[PDB]
Design an enzyme around this catalytic site. Structure first.
Site, short mmCIF file in Angstrom:
data_model
loop_
_atom_site.label_atom_id
_atom_site.label_comp_id
_atom_site.label_asym_id
_atom_site.label_seq_id
_atom_site.Cartn_x
_atom_site.Cartn_y
_atom_site.Cartn_z
CB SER A 140 36.06 39.40 31.41
OG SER A 140 34.69 39.53 31.71
CE1 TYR A 141 37.41 39.49 39.95
CE2 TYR A 141 35.03 39.77 39.69
CZ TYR A 141 36.17 39.77 40.50
OH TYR A 141 36.06 40.06 41.85
CE1 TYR A 151 36.36 35.07 35.87
CE2 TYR A 151 36.85 36.27 33.83
CZ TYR A 151 35.95 35.89 34.82
OH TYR A 151 34.66 36.36 34.82
C1 LIG Z 1 33.00 33.95 33.63
N1 LIG Z 1 31.76 34.36 32.93
C2 LIG Z 1 31.59 33.87 31.55
C3 LIG Z 1 30.88 35.16 33.67
O1 LIG Z 1 31.18 35.49 34.85
C4 LIG Z 1 29.47 35.70 33.17
C5 LIG Z 1 28.35 34.75 33.70
C6 LIG Z 1 28.54 33.29 33.18
C7 LIG Z 1 27.41 32.34 33.61
C8 LIG Z 1 27.19 32.32 35.12
C9 LIG Z 1 26.06 31.37 35.38
C10 LIG Z 1 24.72 31.69 35.54
C11 LIG Z 1 23.70 30.60 35.78
C12 LIG Z 1 24.07 29.29 35.85
C13 LIG Z 1 25.51 28.97 35.67
N2 LIG Z 1 26.12 27.78 35.70
C14 LIG Z 1 27.39 28.14 35.48
N3 LIG Z 1 27.55 29.47 35.34
N4 LIG Z 1 26.42 29.95 35.46
C15 LIG Z 1 26.95 33.76 35.62
C16 LIG Z 1 28.15 34.68 35.27
C17 LIG Z 1 29.29 37.17 33.65
N5 LIG Z 1 27.96 37.67 33.31
C18 LIG Z 1 30.25 38.18 32.98
O2 LIG Z 1 30.23 38.23 31.73
N6 LIG Z 1 31.07 39.02 33.66
C19 LIG Z 1 31.83 39.93 32.90
C20 LIG Z 1 32.67 40.78 33.89
C21 LIG Z 1 32.29 40.16 35.25
F1 LIG Z 1 33.46 39.48 35.48
C22 LIG Z 1 31.24 39.08 35.08
#
Ligand SMILES: CN(C)C(=O)[C@@H]([C@H]1CC[C@H](c2cccc3ncnn32)CC1)[C@H](N)C(=O)N1CC[C@H](F)C1
Ligand SMILES: CN(C)C(=O)[C@@H]([C@H]1CC[C@H](c2cccc3ncnn32)CC1)[C@H](N)C(=O)N1CC[C@H](F)C1
Ligand SMILES: *[C@@H]1O[C@H](CO)[C@@H](O[C@@H]2O[C@H](CO)[C@@H](O)[C@H](O)[C@H]2NC(C)=O)[C@H](O)[C@H]1NC(C)=O
Ligand SMILES: *[C@@H]1O[C@H](CO)[C@@H](O[C@@H]2O[C@H](CO)[C@@H](O)[C@H](O)[C@H]2NC(C)=O)[C@H](O)[C@H]1NC(C)=O
Ligand SMILES: *[C@@H]1O[C@H](CO)[C@@H](O[C@@H]2O[C@H](CO)[C@@H](O)[C@H](O)[C@H]2NC(C)=O)[C@H](O)[C@H]1NC(C)=O
Ligand SMILES: *[C@@H]1O[C@H](CO)[C@@H](O[C@@H]2O[C@H](CO)[C@@H](O)[C@H](O)[C@H]2NC(C)=O)[C@H](O)[C@H]1NC(C)=O
Ligand SMILES: *[C@@H]1O[C@H](CO)[C@@H](O[C@@H]2O[C@H](CO)[C@@H](O)[C@H](O)[C@H]2NC(C)=O)[C@H](O)[C@H]1NC(C)=O
Ligand SMILES: *[C@@H]1O[C@H](CO)[C@@H](O[C@H]2O[C@H](CO)[C@@H](O)[C@H](O)[C@H]2NC(C)=O)[C@H](O)[C@H]1NC(C)=O
Ligand SMILES: *[C@@H]1O[C@H](CO)[C@@H](O[C@H]2O[C@H](CO)[C@@H](O)[C@H](O)[C@H]2NC(C)=O)[C@H](O)[C@H]1NC(C)=O
Ligand SMILES: *[C@H]1O[C@H](CO)[C@@H](O[C@@H]2O[C@H](CO)[C@@H](O)[C@H](O)[C@H]2NC(C)=O)[C@H](O)[C@H]1NC(C)=O
Ligand SMILES: *[C@H]1O[C@H](CO)[C@@H](O[C@@H]2O[C@H](CO)[C@@H](O)[C@H](O)[C@H]2NC(C)=O)[C@H](O)[C@H]1NC(C)=O
Ligand SMILES: *[C@@H]1O[C@H](CO)[C@@H](O)[C@H](O)[C@H]1NC(C)=O
Ligand SMILES: *[C@@H]1O[C@H](CO)[C@@H](O)[C@H](O)[C@H]1NC(C)=O
Ligand SMILES: *[C@@H]1O[C@H](CO)[C@@H](O)[C@H](O)[C@H]1NC(C)=O
Ligand SMILES: *[C@@H]1O[C@H](CO)[C@@H](O)[C@H](O)[C@H]1NC(C)=O
Ligand SMILES: *[C@@H]1O[C@H](CO)[C@@H](O)[C@H](O)[C@H]1NC(C)=O
Ligand SMILES: *[C@@H]1O[C@H](CO)[C@@H](O)[C@H](O)[C@H]1NC(C)=O
Ligand code: NA
Lengths: 728, 728
Positions: free
Chosen positions: A592-593, A509
């Site tokens: 994803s990432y 990831y």
């Molecule tokens: C790991 N994951 C589910 C994510 O990174 C997604 C979100 C998850 C909540 C986070 C977020 C936002 C606000 C509070 C908080 N507390 C914990 N997390 N968190 C902000 C990032 C991102 N939008 C995504 O879908 N991609 C897709 C490709 C690129 F990799 C980023």
């Protein structure tokens, strides 16, 4: 000979993990679903009663998707006709059941296609959003009071978030916040008028003759963002004035100078609300603390109560500036903040003093603040045994910070090293949720004496079943690089023999603040790959990973696609050097990432990997959204970080893919990482004459989680891996 | 020992067929491009002169796409900035060069983004379409007259066709028809106001941040069709002070009762024009013959000169009602029509007589009428040796129909059995183009005594190269199914040994009136598969195929996806019985209609095929366009043919793909057979849990013809076939 954990076992969920999801309704009682009927338990003694017989709505006429009891236990909100939208959003129909007179309310019903509904924190007021406007019902059976008239599909959102605020800023669809006792209703309004739209086809059932074009306001990196406004209305005055005034609280001048975001809303008292703003260049946040002026009906935010955060070596917070936890009187609060050494710890603030006091410290980090009482603050951290991938509950005495007790560490140290918790309304009891390394264990505890009351669910049934299966084992350890340790885990085949050479699959990831090496117990695809195919499935947390301090987490600041990619390659080299890995059979995959890193690795020319699989990968940062991307990459402009934006694309490494076997997969209705991202990867490969395998999933989104598609993609990936590793 | 014809040879065009494309400019001379120079040749003696120096435009500043010399030889139109649209449509920039004063014209030049341009048939007037409106230029340097002002992108089309008329009706973008001497200009106007739009994403270069949504008025089966009007304008009386007046010619009443189409426009004389209309239920066509009335300046179409055509066994014509071929005085005409036996033959019509007289007859068909003089009618038919897949030029004496002479049959029977022809202006000379079974041979002949003047191109250079290559052979034969013979061809590997078992790939199209078994010489993917991989590539023409009479062709009327699919399985079944076929290795593949049939076959549960490949297949007829689909299937309504529309989809057979290896390929920018069609196939397979291989081609259309995509697809398909056949 015992059978192994097969792909069908995984895809058919033959080995079910049991959990114990309860809902605290007070400080001593919780609801638990059993035999489909809703039971109410007494935390103290463990006894219970039937709260809602499973036959109550057998003729309701619809299948109830979910329910929700008002705070005062007088009404129950029934949710049905559930229609999922994005990660958190969805639409549904609602009906209210009067628990007392045991009847359904048939008048002044919540409108069909309601976007969001929430009870007041006390009593039974209701606030809901319909057609992008907010409505409030003081009583379930009485007419609603309209709060906004500006709602406009895909343009003006009152009380609900737009796409990017939902996914990246709030991680929730609702954008309204009731004051503590329910008198005030605060809410945000988003304007997406000039936000560009991502457009993709949605095919639907075969009967649809013309495909539908889905159009969503979505700001890609550097594009026009939605703007936002914040308001507070006094719901207690609704039945006294024809049109209650929504008082706006404006962002500080320091924010109005340019593009900005509303990143936090937290009520402190009945008459004090705090809100936080973040500059579009996410290295400066401003928190305002506002009091209600009973003589002007306005809200004033004393600059002496304004708190600022500035980025040092990277961005602000893990994924957003940290949330405040206010003491009861609203005169002080706690926030997790990285200290001078770069480790995130709890800092105690006086509302009118800018300098806070750290109450925890050490080379480890606080994961979250879970509860706060007059005498103790409870938090989860990875302090125990210095394992960044472990989680335990701690209690710190507010009158003596040197008194810190670990509440979960020693309960069952071998079976339990990863905990989450759920406190009752006033923290009188707490349920501990152990998720690994052993089978999940759920227990209930009394806060007054921190004594275990009883085991709620121990997964004995599953343990019995797994005894007849050659289950794989999991190893969690670290390797030292540049005098700093980086953790990794390996899912090892049954009867693992270190004198043998096993094929290895690097499960990656690696996004900013990610963690793929932990103590959690999982039954997944890797379980089958290790158990049945004898493949070692590994994961590594290199530079950019989280929960180990800023030095490591911020290493990839403004440089996505560099160190986190290289460390993954170095991880594979390190693993082969351990001697039980077949160098000719090293693969890599991610979603994803993880898809992005996998592709970057496969196109690096390193020669370490034979094949790889990228699922729904990002391919160029300019295609991803503004909030997430700009936080780590800044702006895609020559005066800022354009050069790295253009240097970190998967497409530019196309020619190197001639050296590996690649499988690219993407759902066509992916609203998050647009199918566009993989469409550009495939075209770049075609343009340099590289052969590869591909699979699109019609109408699937970023989760490719529909039952049929889920089974189909893992089945497809299984053949690709076995084929790559020459496995029968 | 010598080399074989490889995949790279096919993809890199190592072995090229030479052509001889000439342009007749009179009854005695033709233009031919050589060394990028344009030469003029005298047919009689073969002597030539340079007509246009290749260097004449060395400083033109633009790359010239094509050229078009005015009929009088005074001017040359230079086409550049070519931008392709659909199958025939495109826009370009134009310049006119004066050949007399050897100067480029700079005044009143044709606008940029011109959609269509054409010289008058005589002299040098010009008519072009820009922004959907028609313009006329009496002289290349004079300002143009605006003929129409209603032009509106995607809505009103003047002088050009919309998507469906371009692709399905006229096979041309142009909807302008000059009278014989250029006096009048007739044109059609299409109105797509209520035609639904197909929408799909176009990704473009990597630099494009947001995918673009392409929107095309495209009527799928049963949908709202574009409407059409027909007009004629006098270009000799245009005024620079007054707007041109266009005279409309309304369709007949029997046509105006419901939806209809304009399907043919053919000038008969300087003052007589014929039009043919077809009802939306394509079983009734009406031809009107209209005369210009100098008194009223109107066009009158006497009902006595109206000719009707009806369809009993199927639809009308092969792909459309046949075009009329008028005599010099325009008082009578010839047209190919199906006779009482269901065989297409030439019928002689009197403009004011209902019954026509057949002038040819027999169990074979006239393919096309090529030239007409007062003494002879020249045509191509497959009468020779009763081979439906062979084509020869014949002439029939108009004064005595018993006198029919084959003009190409005996020229070189071993090398030439498939001809095409090009006659000079008054049929004084003709160029014969032989395209098989041997190498293409181009010759010139004089009509007076049918002398073979000389050989223009014999491909002796290619012949010499192919002598050093192990080339495959082609066997053309037939099998009998129910007293009926059906033809097939097999591309046999070098040194074919009937004592060995070869894997077989069934190459299919099988659409209505298709012909895949013929005598044409081709260098294609099958050539490599047979030459290098030793795979037999067979093709079969079963029920529904063309040029063999209506009994065979109309067998699939109102029933696509039935007999033509069943007959391919039968043919393979038979081939698999032959001693030289390996019944464990029989595959099948097709593109477009061929993809549909391949998918229907693979989903039939016949067990005969191990694997298959479908490129851009149709998957359910309601997704395809109205004009083509309804011609063969009627309307998708319960009162008409809905049940069959629903029983003939690929999706309903998904479950049967469990026992075959399937590779599904489609270009995402396919404007013809929408990507939707494959997106629905893949979803149905996922829904029943069947694994398969897929490949989408970003931004490619129905031809998947860009240089890189072309090479990529054939490379990907080659790996799939070899893998299926266990070929190293
Ligand atoms: C790991 N994951 C589910 C994510 O990174 C997604 C979100 C998850 C909540 C986070 C977020 C936002 C606000 C509070 C908080 N507390 C914990 N997390 N968190 C902000 C990032 C991102 N939008 C995504 O879908 N991609 C897709 C490709 C690129 F990799 C980023
Ligand atoms: C073979 N071919 C190129 C076609 O059939 C396409 C046209 C070609 C000109 C014909 C046509 C129209 C008018 C006169 C005429 N004289 C000869 N042909 N012809 C009408 C059919 C068709 N629109 C298509 O693309 N698909 C795609 C899937 C479905 F199979 C039909
Ligand atoms: C759990 O059991 C307790 C004790 O048995 C129940 O307590 C009741 O409390 C009320 C209010 O004080 C008393 O009037 C009753 O006499 C008590 N009942 C008994 C049997 O002692 C309690 O209601 C039970 N809770 C649930 C959810 O079943
Ligand atoms: C949402 O934002 C848009 C600006 O992008 C606002 O629209 C402008 O409104 C003013 C005043 O009516 C007009 O003069 C402008 O022409 C509008 N610009 C555009 C681009 O539409 C809109 O009023 C905002 N809506 C709300 C409810 O705040
Ligand atoms: C309740 O008050 C709001 C706030 O003034 C009213 O909204 C305004 O409505 C007028 C006329 O429709 C618009 O010109 C303003 O731009 C609106 N302002 C806002 C903030 O929306 C609303 O119309 C009132 N509702 C009723 C029933 O009177
Ligand atoms: C919830 O808190 C609000 C705000 O403190 C209370 O409302 C105030 O009540 C006092 C009386 O004690 C009034 O004098 C003020 O005018 C009220 N302020 C406002 C803004 O309405 C409210 O009474 C509390 N509600 C409950 C149920 O305790
Ligand atoms: C093309 O044909 C048209 C129509 O026959 C010719 O125009 C006619 O010419 C005669 C004789 O001069 C006039 O009496 C008519 O009034 C004309 N009719 C129309 C509609 O214009 C025209 O001269 C011919 N052009 C050429 C180059 O032969
Ligand atoms: C082909 O050859 C003839 C000569 O036999 C060329 O000459 C004829 O036409 C010329 C120009 O059109 C004249 O200059 C000659 O006098 C004329 N000769 C005869 C006998 O008619 C003819 O042009 C040549 N054609 C080409 C295209 O080069
Ligand atoms: C093109 O066709 C449209 C109808 O498809 C013509 O408009 C007609 O239909 C409208 C509905 O879209 C009606 O509201 C109009 O009354 C009707 N007539 C007119 C003049 O709009 C339209 O005129 C046609 N355009 C041309 C140039 O013929
Ligand atoms: C169509 O566009 C072309 C390009 O813009 C025009 O051609 C000339 O382009 C140059 C620059 O490339 C300009 O400086 C000239 O003004 C353009 N015109 C000429 C005559 O040179 C062209 O003019 C456009 N078409 C028409 C009909 O004006
Ligand atoms: C031309 O074809 C059409 C369509 O097949 C025929 O129209 C009718 O078709 C239905 C079936 O959809 C039959 O039940 C009717 O008997 C047909 N006739 C009528 C009047 O509805 C039509 O008959 C055909 N025309 C010719 C001359 O054969
Ligand atoms: C509640 O309903 C379930 C069906 O899901 C049934 O099996 C069960 O017996 C019911 N509960 C009780 C206490 O009977
Ligand atoms: C919701 O829609 C259904 C179906 O149209 C209708 O019968 C029902 O009355 C609606 N409910 C409400 C609360 O409007
Ligand atoms: C704020 O962010 C910008 C851009 O990332 C940077 O140039 C500036 O130095 C930062 N300021 C602080 C205090 O970190
Ligand atoms: C015209 O150009 C071609 C190459 O573009 C050249 O080979 C040829 O010699 C030129 N024509 C003449 C008459 O020289
Ligand atoms: C020609 O028609 C157009 C559109 O109807 C009009 O704008 C223009 O003024 C007309 N010109 C003359 C000379 O009538
Ligand atoms: C004749 O053969 C056809 C296939 O060519 C078949 O469908 C039919 O049933 C057979 N019998 C008759 C009477 O047509
Ligand atoms: Na000769």
């Amino acid at each position: 000979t015992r059978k192994t954990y097969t792909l069908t076992d995984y895809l058919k969920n033959t080995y079910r993990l049991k959990l114990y999801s309860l809902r605290w309704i007070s400080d001593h009682e919780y609801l638990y679903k059993q035999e489909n009927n809703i039971l109410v338990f007494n935390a103290e003694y463990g006894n219970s009663s039937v709260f809602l017989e499973n036959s109550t709505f057998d003729e309701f006429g619809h299948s109830i998707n979910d329910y929700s009891i008002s705070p005062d236990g007088q009404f129950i909100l029934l949710e049905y006709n559930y229609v999922k939208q994005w990660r958190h959003s969805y639409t549904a129909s609602y009906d209210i059941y009067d628990l007392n007179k045991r009847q359904l309310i048939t008048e002044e019903r919540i409108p069909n296609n309601t976007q969001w509904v929430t009870w007041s924190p006390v009593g039974h007021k209701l606030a809901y959003v319909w057609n992008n406007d907010i409505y409030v019902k003081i009583e379930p059976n009485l007419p609603s009071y309209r709060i906004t008239w500006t709602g406009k599909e895909d343009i003006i959102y009152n009380g609900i978030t737009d796409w990017v605020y939902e996914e990246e800023v709030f991680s929730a669809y609702s954008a309204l916040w009731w004051s503590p006792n329910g008198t005030f209703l605060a809410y945000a309004q988003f304007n997406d008028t000039e936000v560009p739209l991502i457009e993709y086809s949605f095919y639907s059932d075969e009967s649809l003759q013309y495909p539908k074009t889905v159009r969503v306001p979505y700001p890609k990196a550097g594009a026009v963002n939605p703007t936002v406004k914040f308001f507070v209305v006094n719901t207690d005055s609704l039945s006294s004035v024809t049109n209650a005034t929504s008082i706006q609280i404006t962002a500080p001048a320091s924010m109005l100078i340019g593009d900005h975001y509303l990143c936090d809303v937290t009520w402190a008292t009945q008459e004090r609300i705090s809100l936080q703003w973040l500059r579009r260049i996410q290295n400066y946040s401003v928190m305002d603390i506002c009091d209600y002026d009973e003589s002007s009906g306005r809200w004033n935010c004393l600059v002496a109560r304004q708190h600022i955060e500035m980025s040092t070596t990277g961005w602000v917070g893990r994924f957003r500036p940290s949330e405040p936890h206010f003491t009861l009187d609203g005169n002080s609060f706690y926030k997790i903040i990285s200290n001078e050494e770069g480790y995130r710890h709890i800092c105690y603030f006086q509302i009118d003093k800018k300098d806070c006091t750290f109450i925890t410290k050490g080379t480890w980090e606080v994961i979250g603040i879970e509860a706060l009482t007059s005498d103790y603050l409870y938090y989860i951290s990875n302090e125990y045994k210095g394992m960044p991938g472990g989680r335990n509950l701690y209690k710190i005495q507010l009158s003596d910070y040197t008194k810190v007790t670990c509440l979960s560490c020693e309960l069952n140290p071998e079976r339990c090293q990863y905990y989450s918790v759920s406190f009752s309304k006033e923290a009188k009891y707490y349920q501990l949720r152990c998720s690994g390394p052993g089978l999940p264990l759920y227990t209930l505890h009394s806060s007054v004496n921190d004594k275990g009351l009883r085991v709620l669910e121990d997964n004995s049934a599953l343990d019995k079943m797994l005894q007849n299966v050659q289950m794989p084992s999991k190893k969690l350890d670290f390797i030292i690089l540049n005098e700093t340790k980086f953790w990794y885990q390996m899912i090892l085949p049954p009867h693992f023999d270190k004198s043998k050479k096993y094929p290895l699959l690097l499960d990656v990831y690696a996004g900013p603040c990610s963690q793929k090496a932990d103590t959690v117990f999982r039954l997944n695809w890797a379980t089958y790959l290790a158990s049945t195919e004898n493949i070692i499935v590994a994961s590594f947390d290199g530079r950019g990973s989280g929960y180990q301090g800023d030095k490591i987490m911020h290493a990839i600041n403004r440089r996505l696609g560099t160190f986190e990619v290289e460390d993954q390659i170095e991880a594979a080299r390190q693993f082969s050097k351990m001697g039980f890995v077949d160098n000719k059979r090293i693969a890599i995959w991610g979603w994803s990432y993880g898809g992005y890193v996998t592709s970057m690795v496969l196109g690096s020319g390193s020669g370490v990997f034979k094949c790889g699989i990228a699922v729904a990968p990002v391919s160029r940062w300019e295609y991803y959204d503004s909030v997430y991307t700009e936080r780590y990459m800044g702006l895609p402009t020559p005066e800022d970080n354009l050069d790295h934006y253009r240097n970190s694309t998967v497409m530019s490494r196309a020619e190197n893919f001639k050296q590996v076997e690649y499988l690219l997969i993407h759902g066509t209705a992916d609203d998050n990482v647009h199918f566009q991202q993989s469409a550009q990867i495939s075209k770049a490969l075609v343009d340099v004459g590289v052969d590869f395998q591909a699979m699109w999933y019609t109408d699937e989104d970023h989760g490719i989680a529909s039952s049929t598609a889920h089974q189909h993609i893992y089945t497809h990936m299984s053949h690709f891996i076995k084929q790559c590793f020459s496995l029968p």
